[PDB]
From a paper:
One of the best-characterized drug targets among coronaviruses is the main protease (Mpro, also called 3CLpro). Along with the papain-like protease(s), this enzyme is essential for processing the polyproteins that are translated from the viral RNA. The Mpro operates at no fewer than 11 cleavage sites on the large polyprotein 1ab (replicase 1ab, ~790 kDa); the recognition sequence at most sites is Leu-Gln↓(Ser, Ala, Gly) (↓ marks the cleavage site). Inhibiting the activity of this enzyme would block viral replication.
Numbering used by the authors:
A (entry chain AAA), B (entry chain AAA): 1 to 306
């Protein structure tokens, strides 16, 4: 038992991290097969960043304007292309530590592991969620650009995030591994801000199931609710509306615990209306929304503490 | 910016994890050079566990009563010895992925990364603290025995924890890599329980410094306090007494933020007496005690958001 924000083991990803330099700018890139991926703003200086024209900044570079380092070893770049907001650098060596991998675009509310890196050197790993407002509440300092987010399924690494920038509120924005931003953000220094966020309702419910699997039932009640009565309360508390799809996703957990989804919703509505009264759930005094239903089944016992 | 419970990248440790079987019991072990370390209770069956005599249970095993698997590859055991609550299995192959490493016994209040493993396969990584009561609030299911805790300094892995058991409250107990238990616990099924825990005062203070480095000052005040006046309040709130040594450790953070330690103590005393009033610090509504002063300097900017 116990319940912790757990990250995926980071080994398969550590073996892919490199340093990419272009003039004065050093950041991290990702080395799979004979390609190195990195944020395209590695070609920018400070002043370039107010209003960069990337096509224009890139045409005046060569293969040799990019220095790639895997630990000690310099890698020779022999090709370059822009893909959306990344650069693809073709390199003379295939990464021998290339894991089985895929590139996925994760959906808001989904979770992944971030390997925070500086100068191609991994410094730390943590789990976080794609917020409904398409940001992440990361921990990132200068030099962290190029750090990746990923999930692991069996032996297959699903890369889903590359870090690009911090927004004014201190939250983080970036791209999938095709270089498309998550959210409405662009890779220029402008007046852009995180949209208003909302609580991930499906995750809070998954975590209440986690708390019951772990043998805690204090916050349950004898009431039920309609979806629509739940959603009127959800809106007032800045929670995402629950849908039948989200009710269907909570099925397995519902069955494992024998608590119907709409009963757990009655419990949540009561938790939202009456607070927790200095009480805790799985050690927390707030309602946690950065665990998916999949994260709960992954980490929890397949047999309830009844 | 941002602040997250960050773990060390787990790669160096993943490459050391193996499966150890003895009759019916399978758990994890750690393969450095030509030794495999694992909990000694791997030689026990269910009934053995009420009152095992390990010396007696071990003398009736041979080298070949132990099956060691590194992925596919079976390793041949050619030696065995008990060291306190571990077994050392000498093995015919030196682990080629052996990192530079050390074995340390960490002190209560210190933090480390756990690589949760099942059947020698790493499943997840998370950060936690050695509690003053010598337990950890881990996340561990059946099969997790042998999972290790570690810190990384440059390229050197400091192993400090091996998992052995869950106590009645759902918290976890285990040994250093010499097989000495942390706390008063023994590797038998008896009526043993976690002692009463206390909040790690030094860590809470380090985390308030983190919140100020990150540009939040709301909870500060114009008061100061004596150590002794602080400690009278600490005792009533089940916080550890603060000492001059702990004041000295907070020096660097004190200087980086220009807030004197006893002023931050006045802030904490006020936070303890008056609660937070639905306010947050680095996103939390409770006072966090699982970051050391070292963890804060590691993760935070070396320049304050003034
Ligand atoms: C990234 O480029 C990087 O690390 N590059 C290596 C040379 C160092 C950084 C990483 C940021 C910085 C702090 N945490 C991070 O996440 N990215 C940037 O600095 C941003 C550069 C981008 C260039 C093109 C895309 C848009 C910007 N960048 C630039 C300017 C301002 C911010 N954020 C910011 O001003 O900080 C706070 C919220 C306002 C105080 C930014 O990320
Ligand atoms: C460990 O031996 C293991 O995983 N072995 C592989 C064959 C599976 C487990 C891991 C525990 C179980 C659940 N989470 C974990 O941390 N360790 C044990 O099961 C304990 C065996 C020890 C044998 C010698 C040392 C003392 C016990 N063990 C045995 C009995 C009871 C508990 N805990 C317990 O009863 O659970 C809760 C708190 C009471 C509900 C225990 O860990």
């Amino acid at each position: 038992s116990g319940f912790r924000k757990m990250a995926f083991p980071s080994g398969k990803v550590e073996g892919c991290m490199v340093q990419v330099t272009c003039g004065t700018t050093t950041l991290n890139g990702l080395w799979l097969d004979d390609t190195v991926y990195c944020p395209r703003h590695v070609i920018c200086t400070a002043e370039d960043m107010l209003n960069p024209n990337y096509e224009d900044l890139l045409i005046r570079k060569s293969n040799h304007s990019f220095l790639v380092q895997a630990g000690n070893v310099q890698l020779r770049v022999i090709g370059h292309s822009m893909q959306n907001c990344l650069l693809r650098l073709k390199v003379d060596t295939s990464n021998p530590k290339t894991p089985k991998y895929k590139f996925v675009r994760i959906q808001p509310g989904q979770t992944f592991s971030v390997l925070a890196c500086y100068n191609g050197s991994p410094s730390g790993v943590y789990q976080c969620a794609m917020r409904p407002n398409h940001t992440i509440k990361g921990s990132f300092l200068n030099g962290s650009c190029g750090s990746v987010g990923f999930n692991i399924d069996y032996d297959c690494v699903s890369f889903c995030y590359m870090h690009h920038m911090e927004l004014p509120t201190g939250v983080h924005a970036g791209t999938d591994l095709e270089g498309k931003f998550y959210g409405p953000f662009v890779d220029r220094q402008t007046a852009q801000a995180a949209g208003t966020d909302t609580t991930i309702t499906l995750n809070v419910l998954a975590w209440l199931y986690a708390a019951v699997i772990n043998g805690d039932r204090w916050f349950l009640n004898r009431f039920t609710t309609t979806l629509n009565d739940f959603n009127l309360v959800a809106m007032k508390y800045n929670y995402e509306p629950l849908t039948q799809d989200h009710v269907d996703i909570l099925g397995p957990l519902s069955a494992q615990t024998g608590i119907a989804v709409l009963d757990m919703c009655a419990a949540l509505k009561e938790l939202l209306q009456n607070g927790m009264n200095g009480r805790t759930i799985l050690g927390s005094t707030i309602l946690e929304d950065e665990f998916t239903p999949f994260d709960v089944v992954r980490q929890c016992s397949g047999v309830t503490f009844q």
